[PDB]
Design a protein around this nucleic acid. Structure first.
Ligand SMILES: Nc1c(C(=O)NCc2ccc(F)cc2F)c(=O)n(O)c2ncc(CCCCCO)cc12
Ligand SMILES: Nc1c(C(=O)NCc2ccc(F)cc2F)c(=O)n(O)c2ncc(CCCCCO)cc12
Ligand SMILES: [Mg+2]
Ligand SMILES: [Mg+2]
Ligand SMILES: [Mg+2]
Ligand SMILES: [Mg+2]
Ligand SMILES: [Zn+2]
Ligand SMILES: [Zn+2]
Ligand SMILES: [Zn+2]
Ligand SMILES: [Zn+2]
Lengths: 65, 47, 259, 259, 242, 242, 65, 47
DNA sequence: CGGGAAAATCTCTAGCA
DNA sequence: ACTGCTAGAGATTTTCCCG
DNA sequence: CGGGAAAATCTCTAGCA
DNA sequence: ACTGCTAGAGATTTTCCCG
């Protein structure tokens, strides 16, 4: 199980706040549901709506991660 | 409770005031004389 | 002071002076001046200074018809990625839009379509086509082009790319397909350093993989939480995310217990 | 690597891909990719991302003709203050513009006039009128409205104010004069908390007073400086401002001596 | 600050200078100097004058700022009320006019002029206009040939009389004189607004009885009591409204 | 990191797993796992197939992604070269096609198709298309009545065959299969770019002789020497180009 | 003389830099010439061109200065 | 020495390259085929 | 540790009818 | 009840790389 | 010294054909 | 060799004012 927890924690999330029109940095996807996404940015837990998060597995992961 | 002035559709003249039915992040929906309209918040002043 | 308010109203009904002028000419505090201005119907002429944020879910596209060289180009864009499809249609009518939208639904997993209130997109043909393909239609506010801020932007980009390869193709449809090729597979940038097509492939693959992993985890990790019995989502070394009756909250390890 | 550059050029001549795509598909460093892109004639399509700064001297005005309700309103604005004059003219011809400009030169101390390349302002009549009044003409770049960024802005404001008092006057010229009144004397704000008219009076009075004081001081304070013999401007407790052959410099007390 | 107040009031008791002089001499806040001036018992810029003048068969409106000599002329097609009201509204928008002293003519008492005066907040009344009118006609006669029509000639004469005829005491042109007078008027109006704002306050210092507030700096408070100006530290006096 | 390299190469010598498995098992950088795989001697997604099909008197182009089964059909007015080149350019813009394996027809060998293939960088060759064509015609025959024309019927059949017919091993539809295969291809291409970038380097460690660079982390450097993978601290090995 | 130095140092200058499109705060006019103006902002001496400085004597000086 | 591409007058098509005669803060003056033009820096790329 | 080079990030404008 | 954005160009900050 | 209130400042958009 | 700006609306920071 912990393997899949760590797997789903490998993806990256780019999000935006409610009045912040610039795309925030690549967070760490902790949980992804039907309408919201729980992420951790700079060791701060946030809950961003599904309609404000691009979830990519950056395939420039062949050097780090 | 509230008042909302809006600029609806390619009409530079403003209009109002109108009741505020629901204010959402990005646009509001208001009721002016039994007319339910949707207006972007860039075109609506809320008092 | 009260005579100040009276004279200030009697003057604003004539000149329509802003709150600073009435606060300076009649010794009113800024609160009363703003209250005087905000009660006049003619002096409310500028809305908020902000911008919204369009829907950028991994299953919503934006369509729009642009005009170039006297022909009509129907352009759709995957919002979350920027992968665009385009096709020169003979007329900006409902049938062509419905046909192109059914094509796009056959190719990529579209779940929502966001258009302006053009007759092409507002028709019963695109509606029947959306009802058949399980597509949810989402029209923007009338006469608010910024609501389609993605696709219109792509329009610009698309046109620009045509302006670079227009002399490499005899007709126009060939040039439009070449511009789609260039914008999807030969122009990197964006968020992940990807091109458009690589980014959309990554978006969709990650959506599928994350859905599968989260489904499995939710099937296994079954812990009731107390902080009313909500559902546990993620607990790591200093925080706990709970889901309390359709309201996701985040609490510290304190003020929270797990069963 | 060199084969990389060759293939990258052979591909960019077809696709016209940005420097990131060529740096990613052919393992080129960003410098060589940018050098490849910057050498193509078709891939140079977007200029700088900046904005200039219009002339805001205390002796330069900006004129422009706007259209409202089918009539022509000639509007001038003192750039440094925002005090506007306006007049409804019967036709957007050279004679009316020259007459209004001679009026404005009679009223306020104008020394420069900045207009668009409208025929009204480009004519020989406004030129003879400017030559008679000692006014220096300064046309903006053709088809660059932002170069008159002040007056056009005022246009908006002026029109808005008319939209508030248009029903308080029968004709239009009366409403335009009322809007000028409201914008000059009943709408405070700006830099010094002034209205427009108070701010222009302050600007001109301060110009005159500062010119007089600086003239007197320069007449009295005569110190040659060495740091080549320049002229001394101001020396206070840690700095010295010198004027070395039409080049004003600022030095510390060190590396400077006064005679 | 404390060294300046007594010096300034002693200087005024000596030879009764004006408050601007005291402010510029001892670095005093202008409110304190105004109060020191008002401490001795022994111790206008918006008065425009309009008129009509006939010349070459056409009528010109002439508006003279009495206190400065700055002039504003305009050829109007007919000596009617509408054109007079229009010109007066223009002049009210351009310069801070607060009173118009006309000549009881047939047009300056019309209902349209009265409306335009009630709108711009201009008071109406009913001999410098004659000399300035003769001077303006002299300059028109001088500079007529340099223009074709009469409107341009009148505007050129106005330009000459406003910015090219220096005289008086200091040799300042009419334009510099009017901008200086209006700057002085703005200074007076701002000082009056400050006084009116600070007037309805009250202070209680060191205790002591009531006193009127004069200045509220950073940590110092300058008050007046029994026609005597004092200074105190802030936390030693509490202020209230009235 | 040091604990994982020996474990992974011993596991490969045991039963020769793949490099993705080693990377996901011991948290190794994919380059190191690729090298470990290449350390044993004993140890495609862009191949599209086009064809033309007649039905109801009209011709449809069918392009099948061989490795996945994802289909793309389009009713064209006439089986000519121009329309084939247009459809192929569309397909090249949409999906990352790198080779087209046609049937040596009268249109797929035209000069216009050859030009459109040379532009998009598509190689040309000259049996899964038959079964997929029969399946697509079956679905068209099924869903024909739900549309009026034939274009809409063909597009609906494509939709059904791409996102509503799940089979195979894991029950994934054709669309999910093709997006997964293309994601795998992108991963392979990025790993190949990384290897090609790191390949023309050289390192000198602890001294010692030449060695090929494998990974350059923060303060650790993973090198290879004499078919043996080692790790060193950064300041103990200097890198140069070649 | 020092009286007039202090007098010319009482005026206020609002200026802008070369690529800074927002109006800087009220500086202290130290010297005003034909083409340039030497000011002191936050105890830093600057030389701004004449075409980028509004020089006003803020008549809200009846409270401070 | 330099190269300048510009967008001159209500013509969305760009043109160039052209020699850079004088680059001032706000706008440049360039020489394209013996034609001396002035162009705002927002409409000119300089290499 | 610390100066340059280089990569990354921030700012911002045109155009999308 | 719904919503500006994208890419490039240049300035500015942060990281890298030996010395 | 330190919490609210209030003033001041920062951010930003519409419209200027 | 020349040039975006102005005002209001709301968010955010800094000052004031006693307790
Ligand atoms: N007006 C349209 C624009 C447009 O205005 N572009 C200017 C613009 C300005 C700013 C910005 F950010 C983007 C942006 F495009 C457009 O782009 N599209 O695709 C349209 N498609 C269809 C209709 C018909 C509407 C029918 C009447 C409504 O019921 C209008 C439009
Ligand atoms: N086009 C003109 C605009 C204008 O474009 N406004 C849109 C605009 C956009 C942005 C912005 F910041 C301001 C802004 F106004 C204008 O305002 N004025 O006064 C003009 N006056 C005269 C001519 C005739 C030119 C003759 C041909 C050139 O030789 C044109 C214009
Ligand atoms: Mg449209
Ligand atoms: Mg559009
Ligand atoms: Mg114009
Ligand atoms: Mg204009
Ligand atoms: Zn009002
Ligand atoms: Zn190119
Ligand atoms: Zn006295
Ligand atoms: Zn092996």
């Amino acid at each position: 199980l912990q393997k899949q927890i760590t797997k789903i924690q490998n993806f990256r999330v780019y999000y935006r706040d409610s009045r912040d029109p610039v795309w925030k940095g690549p967070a760490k996807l902790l949980w992804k549901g039907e309408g919201a996404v729980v992420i951790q940015d700079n060791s701060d837990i946030k809950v961003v709506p599904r309609r404000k998060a691009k979830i990519i597995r950056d395939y420039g992961k062949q050097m780090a991660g | 409770n509230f008042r909302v002035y809006y600029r609806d559709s390619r009409d530079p003249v403003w209009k109002g005031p109108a009741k505020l039915l629901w204010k959402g992040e990005g646009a509001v929906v208001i009721q002016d004389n039994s007319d339910i309209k949707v207006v972007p918040r860039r075109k609506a002043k809320i008092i | 002071f009260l005579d100040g308010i009276d004279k200030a109203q009697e003057e604003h009904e004539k000149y329509h002076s802003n709150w600073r002028a009435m606060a300076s000419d009649f010794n009113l505090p800024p609160v009363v001046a703003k209250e005087i201005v905000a009660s006049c119907d003619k002096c409310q002429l500028k809305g908020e200074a902000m911008h919204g944020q369009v829907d950028c879910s991994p299953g919503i596209w934006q369509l729009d018809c642009t005009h170039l060289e006297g022909k009509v180009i129907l352009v759709a864009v995957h919002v979350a990625s920027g992968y665009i499809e385009a096709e020169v249609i003979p007329a900006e009518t409902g049938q062509e839009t419905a046909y192109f939208l059914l094509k796009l639904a056959g190719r990529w997993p579209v779940k929502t379509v966001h258009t302006d209130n053009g007759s092409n997109f507002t028709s019963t043909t695109v509606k029947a086509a959306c009802w058949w393909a399980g597509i949810k239609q989402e029209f923007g506010i009338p006469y608010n082009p910024q609501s389609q801020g993605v696709i219109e932007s792509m329009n610009k980009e698309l046109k620009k790319i045509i302006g670079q390869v227009r002399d490499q193709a005899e007709h126009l449809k060939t040039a439009v397909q070449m511009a789609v090729f260039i914008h999807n597979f030969k122009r990197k940038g964006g968020i992940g350093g990807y091109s458009a097509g690589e980014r959309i492939v990554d978006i969709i693959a990650t959506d599928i993989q994350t859905k599968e992993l989260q489904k499995q985890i939710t099937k296994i990790q079954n812990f009731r939480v107390y902080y009313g019995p909500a559902k546990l989502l993620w607990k790591g070394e200093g925080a706990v995310v709970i889901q309390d009756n359709s309201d996701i909250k985040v609490v510290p390890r304190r003020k929270a217990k797990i069963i």
